[PDB]
Design a binder for this molecule. Structure first.
Ligand SMILES: *Cc1[nH]c(Cc2[nH]cc(CCC(=O)O)c2CC(=O)O)c(CCC(=O)O)c1CC(=O)O
Length: 294
């Protein structure tokens, strides 16, 4: 059966991602008929509903938005080639974070982004910002913020690379799990769909994201959590860095692991456990408020 139906969110960025996946599919399988089923754990739930009741065959997500847990019968089966994983400084009136005067307003609702900015620059005012990329840029242009923090990859994909005033190195702002990579979820028993997706998997990115996600999973993380988790392949090994921070920047718990790619999952679990035992458990508890990772 030649049809593959893609469930996606309906934003410009989300639809760009659905086209990316559709184009890769058509390139590998010229006989396929690819259909889009746009709609809408926050966002992914409706997509997963569609998979479970056979209205869609795959759901395409940005990796960092993929939940740590899945309903019976679904899973993340493909991790596509990673784009730039970094955060970006975006500003009309200033050329860097360094240039912002005390009391400047920087927008982001990421507690991961916030704790790290606040660690280094407690004089800056960090203000919530929500919405699609286009809307967030509008609020900036409208004067609501002196600067905002967005992902490099999103801006590049939307043709808005001119908005990247500065890319932030991972040592300055450690990325969200799988930032820059697209992931695909489907029904685990659907061997036809999984065979069609095989050509889209990028093994090197999949190794990195495996480590990162194992770390986050053990911390019972999500987007609403001040967690950084970021791996690179360096001289045949996976190098995983992680952090958990108090949003006010007062305490940031950090650690690292290096090892063979086949150990990606156990490395991430081990690192998570180390952070938990060195203060992260208590920080997370004040965020989930009560609930702590066991
Ligand atoms: C988990 C989480 N989601 C978002 C919003 C979002 N999701 C995907 C992108 C594009 C980049 C990519 O594909 O990886 C974006 C927007 C963006 O980061 O530019 C966020 C950001 C929340 C915020 O800053 O308000 C987060 C949390 C987090 O990144 O730590």
């Amino acid at each position: 059966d030649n049809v593959l139906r893609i469930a996606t969110r309906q934003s410009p960025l989300a639809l760009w991602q659905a086209h990316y996946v559709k184009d890769k599919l058509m390139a590998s399988h010229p006989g396929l008929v690819v259909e889009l089923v746009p709609m809408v754990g926050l966002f992914v739930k409706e997509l997963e509903v569609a998979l479970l009741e056979n209205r869609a065959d795959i759901a395409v997500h940005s990796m960092k938005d993929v939940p740590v847990e899945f309903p019976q019968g679904l899973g993340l089966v493909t991790i596509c080639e990673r784009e730039d994983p970094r955060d970006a400084f975006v500003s009309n009136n200033y050329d860097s974070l360094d240039a912002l005067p005390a009391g400047s307003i920087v927008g982001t609702s990421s507690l991961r982004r916030q704790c790290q900015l606040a660690e280094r620059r407690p004089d800056l005012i960090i203000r919530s910002l929500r919405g699609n990329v286009g809307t967030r840029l509008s609020k900036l242009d409208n004067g609501e913020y002196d600067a905002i923090i967005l992902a490099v990859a999103g801006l590049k994909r939307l043709g808005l690379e001119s908005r990247i005033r500065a890319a932030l190195p991972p040592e300055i702002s450690l990325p969200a799990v799988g930032q820059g990579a697209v992931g695909i979820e489907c029904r685990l028993d659907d061997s036809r769909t999984r065979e069609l997706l095989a050509a889209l998997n990028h093994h090197e990115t999949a190794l990195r994201v495996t480590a990162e996600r194992a770390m986050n999973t053990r911390l019972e993380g999500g987007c609403q959590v001040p967690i950084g988790s970021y791996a690179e392949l360096i001289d045949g090994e996976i190098w995983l860095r992680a952090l958990v921070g108090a949003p006010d920047g007062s305490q940031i718990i950090r650690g690292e692991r290096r090892g063979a790619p086949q150990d990606a999952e156990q490395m991430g679990i081990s690192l998570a456990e180390e952070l938990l035992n060195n203060g992260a458990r208590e920080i997370l508890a004040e965020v989930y408020n009560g609930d702590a990772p066991a």
